[model samples]
Target chain A: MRLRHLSDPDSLPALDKSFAIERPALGLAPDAPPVRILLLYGSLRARSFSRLAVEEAARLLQFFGAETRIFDPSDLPLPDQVQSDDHPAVKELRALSEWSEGQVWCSPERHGQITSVMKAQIDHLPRPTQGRTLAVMQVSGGSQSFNAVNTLRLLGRWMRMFTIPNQSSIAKAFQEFDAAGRMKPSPYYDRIADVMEELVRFTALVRPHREALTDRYSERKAAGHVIDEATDLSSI
Target chain B: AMRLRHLSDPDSLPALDKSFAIERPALGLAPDAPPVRILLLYGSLRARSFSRLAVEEAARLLQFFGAETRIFDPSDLPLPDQVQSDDHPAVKELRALSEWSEGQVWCSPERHGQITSVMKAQIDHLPLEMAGIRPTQGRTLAVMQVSGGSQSFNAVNTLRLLGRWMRMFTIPNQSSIAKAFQEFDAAGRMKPSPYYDRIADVMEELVRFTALVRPHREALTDRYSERKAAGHVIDEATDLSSIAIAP
Candidate 1:
């Protein structure tokens, strides 16, 4: 049987061709390891369900032989609209987004929607993670809430990312996990595993040249100007 | 559709009366009591403000439910600090509305995806509680948000949290008008949209619930007095329980 959650591979026509161009840009050795997974958890609570969910998914990712890193956004200060690129928090968030080939974002539903804390974290990320792979999910208090997950998906689109189709929302999450925050033997646990596995496969498929696929021709036009040149490519 | 007004069924008033007369006991209202009064406040002074238009639609919906509706324009409203005393005309008018109504509706634009400064300033000026009782406590609240682009409930979500924190009972139905400029006509009236109907649903629910709770006003007053006598900050004054309202 076909996996119901995976997007039609043909729809991503650029994935293969883009990866081909990206390989030489990174200058990786022919036999180096595969994709890098970046994990972001939404809450700072000591017993945060979103963080616990991401941690559980991380172990499954490790089993798939993917290189991974988890970002701690707690120390990141609020963005100063006036502050240039060199701010410590700005540099750290950008470095993490730049370093990753795939990402997992898990946030909690607050006031019937995504928490401001989570939005603040997304706001801090570099504005150019376009074409990178992302898997989004949310943990709900009482029942299945797709609110935060849906909002995160829109944010991923706004950031110009190729989001994987599979997503999981754990309902009555407070009761579904054990005291140690381990997911119980249930359908949710299986779904979380499925989403992560799909993310890794998609990342591998899209990794060769992700950057070039997301480039805008408008930016290229502006990039060539060195105080105005006479060379015109209007015919092309 | 540019239809901006809704007229209640000529016989709807009688139908509502009959149903309410029979169910009056269940709602804790006298058989002939009128519906609760509600005031709609939007924060913005622009001529074609989506915030004002959304609140105007809310007022109409409230009227459809057989409730009295008043719309407050922020045009003449001064900044909170500028109006140093509660006696200031705008401040006094707002407070009087708070005293006269049993429920309130707040609709505002989301700028930079957060509540507008004007809306925040409006809310900041209102006393958390009035006359030894929480001004909005147990009173019904309905929230709406307008965006110039694709829909985001970020503003409504923030308002709802503040409502809860203020001890108001926020209705479950919330509306967010996305591409707000396109959703309204040149006449500054909300046009046909899914969001238009959603706002109606919220206002209808708020009117029903507020009417059901209005009869408890005396009990609310007593509860506030007792809580205050026992050393509660009814108006946020330091230990003001010793002072009682002269009745």
Candidate 2:
């Protein structure tokens, strides 16, 4: 075996050169469902600007005609705290991960890096999110910094998610939020909107051939599974 | 509020030519102190975890150099934000080890192209300060990573970032051993190779840095602007309260 456990062998699709050519030729389904996106914000402060930033992104996502769910990380236990998956927070986060076709991770930069509060949420998510799209954003207490976003990007890659190139880092996050918790009008706001828009477009374009696109030969072989030649994404 | 009075005249200066020798206590080491104290942390829980094996190898090297080293097992470490008490056994143990350490070596496995949660959890558990003590401030750090496939530096890079965040001085040298499984022998000791040589180099550098920096740790950690930013005005009298006096 392989290092990771692949639970469902039958579900994995095959890939070949010709299937790759045909996958792009397959047009978008007119009846395709609304893009399902999950938003996760870091920090538990009463007036967390990261939460405010994610809320702003969620509104933009809805305006772009996509469905979104923002996961509240409060009271969420760290990874391996309890063995049972019945815990409310753990169950909710796992279910959300399975439901999401894409994700937006917004975190506050604490002590020059992403806070442990944010990393804890990710640790609780399902290990492999095959073919999920990811967008990262951060709110900094001081000057704008990419440490949190860069780390989140690495995490997105580790979960096998496709991270969109566009990202947002709001500097002096305190000054950007109004007393009502709504983000003020600024270039930072426009960038968050851009990130959300890009996430939606990437999710739609990648969802159709996700299984074929994500299937790996080495992982399949490790699970004692075989290749199905019929629907291979690549023909070669 | 009483205006802080200066202990010495602001313009007073000793004549440069008249000075024979000026004693610098901060630059000197304690006469009876042992070699640098180091804590080693590694990721992965497999019985044959390469990261653990790599840490053990570093520990042996540290011992050879006459430094006291402790290797911390990440197993049983509660995840971040899970425990509310500082009295938890594992939490107490981890924090105590961190406090006793003058330097640290972080070894982690590259999982899914990043440091494993096992590693991150260990770090997250130790806050920058517990009560009045800064757990990692002004300490020295060395990072190493073990990769199951071809070599990668992702884990080491992340460790360096965390070290900086903790206000520790991370050594410039780092070790990233690829195909980690092939590097060890039947006894789990790392075989002699270029990778082994690099680990030796890192540990040696860590010891040298710790010795050089530990004498002035308090001075190094005293940030003037940071204290001012925190709304504290420091004059001669106020600075005395901040100094940590040894027993």
Candidate 3:
């Protein structure tokens, strides 16, 4: 019997060969350890589809040989609830973020956008989340909607993370899962797989060159006298 | 010398004034109920937060338009997960204000091209449904943003997205003030400019929408999907006691 969640090793594409052959040309070390990835899901529901969705994505990432960690927002303080350096959950989240080379954020759409649960997690992260690869996904209770994913993309850009071009928005999220809480077979499942495939490829291509990729002349110039000058970070 | 104009200054800018005049009242409102209730939310805890100044300007206009208004402070409100209970004073106060208002004006300083977390936390604290009561649905919302640099719509657009998700009737008009520091006077009031004029326009529109919609809010928001989700009987008039969220 063929299991839907697992990808066949034989069916894995020839691009693997291309990636291996081109690693040196692309400045990547052939012996580099598995890409470190951190996954975040937004929702505390007993059967949260967003959590299930990220778990599926994690399986695929592990299959692709990338190490992954999923952060639990439970007991995490809201942004600015307490001093940043003291909160245990906050510390755990930041540590995971610093350790990972890439990240995935999946949220359930509440009302018509990402829930406050999701926004709270993003809000608590330390600034200058520069040069990490980000993939965004959203699960909706109603018809297919791009509002949450689009908002997440905008936020990912603001955090200075390189958000992948591909995204996933699963509609009627409740129907997409089974009695055991596993995601069932559907185009939604296929798209998530596609997103994970692209994420692994992008993480490999970008991890080694992040410093050069994110370097900005403006930031360098501002680091001088502008370093301590307050310029209305009130919004942030 | 300073000059103040009516909230709807037709003579100042004919096109802008004309836009504010455009409205379609769908139902008969009680001609003399308590004046429209409006709550203003501003994002920024800065000593001289321009977003706060902008909200102050809008609140003045809302009052001038004959509506009652209140501005909620995000200063003492704990972050979303920090409170051990929903009954925490700050959270309770924010949620009360949300339930009290018929319309809301959201003002935020654009931080990194998005609404600040301070502003988002306020919204997050007011859940769509808490114990079967909806706090934001069927209310009218107006979005405004203040930017440190040149004008940008990133914050306003994202706020509108949130407004839609909350099932709010977000006004079409929006304001984005660029170089926010320069837009305010020494006394912290917004200086007279087209930006201030635009805020006046938005406040006027919000008051008008609130008047037209608030009286029939329950009927306006009656939806099959929500009804099913709430497990209420079909075709029955909404029971305010069952879902009325009191401040």
TM per prediction: 0.43, 0.46, 0.47
Over all chains combined, what TM-score does candidate 3 have?
A: 0.47
Two-chain DockQ for model 3: 0.02
Model 2 lDDT per residue over B166-215, tens place: 76766656789999989886767676666876676567556655765566
lDDT of 3 by residue, A1-236 (tens): 11123223323221222212111111222225888888888888877899888887887677667777888787787654564567787777778889888899999888777877788788877745876878899998899989788788778756867666556899999998877677786667766765675566556655665553443223333344232223534422
Error of 2 at A173 (Å): 13
Error of 2 at B7 (Å): 52
lDDT score for residue B214 of model 1: 57
For candidate 2, report its TM-score.
0.46
**What's model 2's lDDT at B220?**
49
**Model 1 CA lDDT for position B94:** 69
Rank all candidate structures by their TM-score, best first, as comma-separated numbers.
3, 2, 1
Candidate 3 per-residue C-alpha lDDT over B36-98 given as tens digits, one digit per residue, 9 for 90 to 100:
898888889887889987887887677656677778877778887786765678887778788
lDDT of 2 by residue, A21-95 (tens): 111101222114778898888888888888778877776666556777888777687654654667788788888
Tell me the docking grade of candidate 2: incorrect
Q: List the residue pairs that clash in candidate 1.
A: A18-A209, A19-A208, A19-A209
Candidate with the greatest TM-score versus the true structure: 3
TM-score of chain B of each: 0.75, 0.80, 0.81
Where is the poorest 10-residue window by lDDT in model 1 chain A? A18-27
Identify the runs in model 3 with alpha carbons over 4 angstroms from their true place: A1-236, B1-32, B229-231, B235-247
